[PDB]
């Protein structure tokens, strides 16, 4: 592992220090369908005409990014995603900008969001949840070794591919930081207590977030929920969580160590690092090398039907991609 990560860091740093820029143009793609939309911008299925390859294209309105004060965060996302390469991450295949928008082109995962399948099916079995969890543990090990914090783990950001493996996407809050950081960001249900309490925090917030994800996957609902964020925050800082009776002893023990308010005891954050997690009894049946190699049989595989098939995604109102005749926010996004 240490060896693999050493070389991964060398690979990453070359691209980190000399980012790829302006590697395609909008006219090289045929837009097909909107796969998601919100404050994060929009993500569309597109076809690259020269190859006929399908991709997911994230489109950000530069003016909207500025109003949301997400300039630096958006520059983080692009700079990080063009530099990484990992089986369970969506790296950038291309990026470019025009007068109005920023564009990031990534591998398309046709299986839909984990969120969709989790909600519909209700909950995942422990083996099913563990298969996904293993991929997140490996991804965080990778990211963290590059001094990257992800900061938005949730089912909504985990895409299922044709083989039933997952891709972490949306790096809008991801940041390369060696010390502590302070930004209040994330999704309410997944926020570590130290974020809520406005403390300086570190990569340990990703491991807390993993605890929330594993709980939600296995229970079908998150460990801290309420109708409004403030009441969710009250539950998170309180220091208490209940587990469904169907949770195995080993699962409960893993989650008590992930959802640990005390940073000196939170798994992932201790002296032995990620191995406290990898060597936990709940992961005893996990062949970590086989997960990484994608040789493990996925416990759920999505309906095939086609290469640019979108039936595993919800339907969103389709909005124009408008391009102003005037360049907006040129200085703000000069490095993009």
């Amino acid at each position: 592992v240490k060896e693999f990560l050493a070389k991964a860091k060398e690979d990453f740093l070359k691209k980190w220090e000399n980012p790829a820029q302006n590697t395609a143009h909008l006219d090289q793609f045929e837009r097909i369908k909107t796969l998601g939309t919100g404050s994060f911008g929009r993500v569309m299925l597109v076809k690259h005409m020269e190859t006929g390859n399908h991709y997911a294209m994230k489109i950000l309105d530069k003016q909207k990014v500025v109003k949301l004060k997400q300039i630096e965060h958006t520059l983080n996302e692009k700079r990080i995603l063009q530099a990484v390469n990992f089986p369970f991450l969506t790296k950038l295949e291309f990026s470019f900008k025009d007068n109005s928008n920023l564009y990031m082109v990534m591998e398309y995962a046709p299986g839909g969001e984990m969120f969709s399948h989790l909600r519909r099916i209700g909950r995942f079995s422990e083996p099913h949840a563990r298969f996904y969890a293993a991929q997140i543990v490996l991804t965080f090990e990778y990211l963290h070794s590059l001094d990257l914090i992800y900061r938005d783990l949730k089912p909504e950001n985990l895409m299922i591919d044709q083989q039933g493996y997952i891709k972490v996407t949306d790096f809008g809050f991801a940041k390369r930081v060696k010390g502590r950081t302070w930004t209040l960001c994330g999704t309410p249900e997944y926020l570590a207590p130290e974020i809520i309490l406005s403390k300086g925090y570190n990569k340990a917030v990703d491991w807390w977030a993993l605890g929330v994800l594993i709980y939600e996957m296995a229970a079908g609902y998150p460990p801290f929920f309420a109708d409004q964020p403030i009441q969710i925050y009250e539950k998170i800082v309180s220091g208490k969580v209940r587990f469904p009776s169907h949770f195995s002893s080993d699962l409960k023990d893993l989650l008590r160590n992930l959802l640990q308010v005390d940073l000196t005891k939170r798994f992932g954050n201790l002296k032995n690092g990620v191995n406290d997690i990898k060597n936990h009894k709940w992961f005893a049946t996990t062949d970590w090398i086989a997960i990484y190699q994608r040789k493990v049989e996925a416990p759920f595989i999505p309906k095939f039907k086609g290469p640019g098939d979108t039936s595993n995604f919800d339907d969103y109102e389709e909005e124009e991609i408008r391009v102003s005749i005037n360049e907006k926010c040129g200085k703000e996004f000069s490095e993009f």
């Binding site: 969120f115 909600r119 249900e189 309420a226 109708d227 964020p229």
Partner: peptide, 20 residues
């Protein structure tokens, strides 16, 4: 049940990142 309370809540749909 906890499941029943979750399903009746306003937070079973896609959750947005926090702003400020």
């Amino acid at each position: 049940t906890t499941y029943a309370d979750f399903i009746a809540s306003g937070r079973t749909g896609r959750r947005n990142a926090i702003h400020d």
